[PDB]
Scaffold this active site. Structure first.
Site, mmCIF file in Angstrom:
data_model
loop_
_atom_site.group_PDB
_atom_site.id
_atom_site.type_symbol
_atom_site.label_atom_id
_atom_site.label_comp_id
_atom_site.label_asym_id
_atom_site.label_seq_id
_atom_site.Cartn_x
_atom_site.Cartn_y
_atom_site.Cartn_z
ATOM 1 N N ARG B 9 -13.585 -3.633 -38.281
ATOM 2 C CA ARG B 9 -13.148 -2.880 -39.450
ATOM 3 C C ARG B 9 -11.676 -3.165 -39.730
ATOM 4 O O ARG B 9 -10.856 -3.175 -38.810
ATOM 5 C CB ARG B 9 -13.305 -1.392 -39.158
ATOM 6 C CG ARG B 9 -13.742 -0.541 -40.260
ATOM 7 C CD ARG B 9 -13.606 0.912 -39.857
ATOM 8 N NE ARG B 9 -13.514 1.710 -41.069
ATOM 9 C CZ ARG B 9 -13.749 3.008 -41.154
ATOM 10 N NH1 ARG B 9 -14.078 3.708 -40.081
ATOM 11 N NH2 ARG B 9 -13.644 3.603 -42.331
ATOM 12 N N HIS B 10 -11.313 -3.337 -40.991
ATOM 13 C CA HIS B 10 -9.897 -3.561 -41.283
ATOM 14 C C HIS B 10 -9.078 -2.296 -41.006
ATOM 15 O O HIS B 10 -9.613 -1.228 -40.701
ATOM 16 C CB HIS B 10 -9.717 -3.969 -42.731
ATOM 17 C CG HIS B 10 -10.140 -2.895 -43.673
ATOM 18 N ND1 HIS B 10 -9.327 -1.830 -43.981
ATOM 19 C CD2 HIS B 10 -11.312 -2.680 -44.314
ATOM 20 C CE1 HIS B 10 -9.965 -1.026 -44.812
ATOM 21 N NE2 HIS B 10 -11.169 -1.521 -45.032
ATOM 22 N N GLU B 12 -5.184 0.038 -41.916
ATOM 23 C CA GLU B 12 -4.652 1.003 -42.892
ATOM 24 C C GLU B 12 -4.285 0.391 -44.237
ATOM 25 O O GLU B 12 -3.679 -0.684 -44.308
ATOM 26 C CB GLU B 12 -3.374 1.618 -42.347
ATOM 27 C CG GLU B 12 -3.466 2.921 -41.664
ATOM 28 C CD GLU B 12 -2.079 3.416 -41.373
ATOM 29 O OE1 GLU B 12 -1.239 3.333 -42.294
ATOM 30 O OE2 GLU B 12 -1.823 3.856 -40.234
ATOM 31 N N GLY B 13 -4.564 1.144 -45.309
ATOM 32 C CA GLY B 13 -3.932 0.921 -46.594
ATOM 33 C C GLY B 13 -3.318 2.209 -47.122
ATOM 34 O O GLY B 13 -3.500 3.286 -46.539
ATOM 35 N N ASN B 16 -5.482 5.150 -47.509
ATOM 36 C CA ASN B 16 -5.855 5.699 -46.211
ATOM 37 C C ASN B 16 -4.829 6.724 -45.752
ATOM 38 O O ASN B 16 -5.183 7.826 -45.315
ATOM 39 C CB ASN B 16 -6.004 4.576 -45.181
ATOM 40 C CG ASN B 16 -7.100 3.577 -45.554
ATOM 41 O OD1 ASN B 16 -6.849 2.381 -45.684
ATOM 42 N ND2 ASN B 16 -8.319 4.073 -45.734
ATOM 43 N N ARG B 61 -8.674 -6.468 -48.504
ATOM 44 C CA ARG B 61 -8.281 -5.933 -47.202
ATOM 45 C C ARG B 61 -9.154 -6.481 -46.065
ATOM 46 O O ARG B 61 -8.694 -6.560 -44.924
ATOM 47 C CB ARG B 61 -8.327 -4.405 -47.211
ATOM 48 C CG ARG B 61 -9.692 -3.824 -47.521
ATOM 49 C CD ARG B 61 -9.474 -2.395 -47.962
ATOM 50 N NE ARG B 61 -10.636 -1.529 -48.039
ATOM 51 C CZ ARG B 61 -11.333 -1.300 -49.147
ATOM 52 N NH1 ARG B 61 -11.012 -1.923 -50.276
ATOM 53 N NH2 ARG B 61 -12.346 -0.420 -49.138
ATOM 54 N N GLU B 88 -17.648 -2.405 -48.553
ATOM 55 C CA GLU B 88 -17.675 -0.998 -48.231
ATOM 56 C C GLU B 88 -18.727 -0.321 -49.103
ATOM 57 O O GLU B 88 -19.111 -0.824 -50.163
ATOM 58 C CB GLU B 88 -16.275 -0.400 -48.434
ATOM 59 C CG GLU B 88 -16.080 1.059 -48.054
ATOM 60 C CD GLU B 88 -16.492 1.371 -46.630
ATOM 61 O OE1 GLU B 88 -15.620 1.564 -45.765
ATOM 62 O OE2 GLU B 88 -17.696 1.426 -46.363
ATOM 63 N N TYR B 91 -18.833 4.639 -53.219
ATOM 64 C CA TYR B 91 -18.728 6.087 -53.071
ATOM 65 C C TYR B 91 -18.835 6.836 -54.396
ATOM 66 O O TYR B 91 -18.455 8.013 -54.462
ATOM 67 C CB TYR B 91 -17.415 6.448 -52.381
ATOM 68 C CG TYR B 91 -17.578 6.657 -50.908
ATOM 69 C CD1 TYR B 91 -18.333 7.718 -50.425
ATOM 70 C CD2 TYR B 91 -17.005 5.785 -49.997
ATOM 71 C CE1 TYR B 91 -18.506 7.918 -49.071
ATOM 72 C CE2 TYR B 91 -17.173 5.967 -48.625
ATOM 73 C CZ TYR B 91 -17.930 7.042 -48.172
ATOM 74 O OH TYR B 91 -18.101 7.253 -46.828
ATOM 75 N N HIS B 187 -16.140 -3.388 -43.145
ATOM 76 C CA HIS B 187 -15.626 -2.038 -43.301
ATOM 77 C C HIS B 187 -16.492 -1.071 -42.514
ATOM 78 O O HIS B 187 -17.475 -1.458 -41.867
ATOM 79 C CB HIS B 187 -15.574 -1.623 -44.775
ATOM 80 C CG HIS B 187 -15.022 -2.678 -45.688
ATOM 81 N ND1 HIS B 187 -13.726 -2.653 -46.155
ATOM 82 C CD2 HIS B 187 -15.602 -3.766 -46.246
ATOM 83 C CE1 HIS B 187 -13.536 -3.674 -46.972
ATOM 84 N NE2 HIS B 187 -14.661 -4.363 -47.045
#
Lengths: 243, 254
Positions: B9-10, B12-13, B16, B61, B88, B91, B187
């Site tokens: 999993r990548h 922080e952005g 996040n 990312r 990802e 959502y 992700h």
């Protein structure tokens, strides 16, 4: 017509120690990365939208494409890498200081070794400081032709001979089928592809002078032969260097 | 016959840190997410991993995470291939909204089900959404194995599996069969969905897998490409568990 962009990476430490990088996988420096970062800012200003990117297997060519793709926000664009776009194999001249090789053999021989369509330098041999770093590297064990069959030195003509199949077989189909392509390559492999497209002679090609960090547009016909000289895109406050 | 695979999993952005939903919004790593990438690379190099192929989503990312790891490894020449099929989870209308506020206005139970459940579908995204056009007008989603209008407008974990498994079957798993060493830079939800299929995790148990960010996930498979045991995390034991309590706490209140 069709369009196509090639370029060449910027500077590294050996490009400032005035040395022969060649197949040594030497990295870019602050200015080398910034140059490609600026080059992508330029293609962005130009509204450039690529489909495929082609590189050598040397990282200075790859980071260059990658830094460019980040400035464009085009990181999802497919990338392909191939030994056939590598810088020229300078044989035993690898890694030595050129302004002192001119001190052993004389300017006329060192000049000829780099501005010659037909002259092969001395072959790098197992004793060379960097023979192992090149030929033992895993990236040359998975190539399209065996390890022993890779050249230990190359003329500028040698570069085109190993390059041209990759153009005929991997690239040319795609530039045929609409794809806007970027080619992130080196000083000699760029020089050789331009010859085969602009039909340059075995004697005019040693004159051709391509800047670094600078996009190189080139238009073609359905024959995929050139339609004009190579032109340089961006802020033409870009007429610098060339020794 | 005994395969190994690395998935992760990548890191922080910006969103996040803001505790928002990114989903298909093409948010960049911040510089701490960049260091997670580099730390993965260092650990992978200390195990002398030699990758033959890397797969990613088309969200940058996950691509940058991969490019960073290759550089740490000295393997920038290793082919990289990207696909919306490793994206990802979409959502829906919760894209851009804070997680702790969602728990305040719906309960921590509802938020947990929204984030980690198998067949709860988000409220779909509508043309009103501030990030609608920038998503479905992006060139990357054009030349595909699916029409632009057919791309989802929200997604259950099950919907993710149904679009990710064909890419596993036809693109990643054959390369595993050949003996190549594979890295998967993806992700949270796309990795859970493939872990669910490889491990045969029940609809009811996948709710309880939280994946830590920036951490290599080692998977061993047999000659039928099913897990040999549960996926394992590389890195310090306690720090991974602490990083896991972290991720689930994003959906819990003061």
């Amino acid at each position: 017509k069709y369009k196509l962009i090639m370029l060449r990476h910027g500077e590294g430490a050996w490009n400032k120690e005035n040395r022969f990088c060649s197949w040594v996988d030497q990295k870019l420096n602050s200015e080398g990365m910034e140059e490609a970062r600026n080059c992508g800012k330029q293609l962005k200003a130009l509204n450039f939208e690529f489909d495929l990117v082609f590189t050598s297997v040397l990282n200075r060519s790859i980071h260059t494409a990658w830094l460019i793709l980040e400035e464009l926000g085009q990181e999802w664009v497919p990338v392909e890498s191939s030994w056939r776009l590598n810088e020229r194999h300078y044989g035993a001249l690898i890694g030595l200081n050129r302004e002192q090789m001119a001190l052993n053999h004389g300017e006329e021989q060192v000049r000829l070794w780099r501005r010659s369509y037909n002259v092969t330098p001395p072959p790098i041999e197992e004793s060379h400081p960097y023979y192992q770093e090149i030929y033992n590297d895993r990236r040359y064990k998975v190539c399209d032709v065996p390890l022993d069959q890779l050249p230990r030195s190359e003329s500028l003509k040698d570069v085109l001979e190993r390059l041209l199949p990759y153009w005929n077989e991997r690239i040319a189909p795609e530039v045929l089928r609409g794809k806007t392509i970027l080619i992130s390559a080196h000083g000699n492999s760029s020089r050789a592809l331009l010859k085969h497209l602009e039909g340059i002679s075995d004697e005019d090609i040693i004159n051709i002078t391509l800047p670094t960090g600078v996009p190189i547009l080139l238009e073609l016909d359905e024959n995929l032969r050139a339609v004009g000289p190579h032109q340089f895109l961006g802020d033409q406050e870009a007429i610098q260097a060339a020794i």
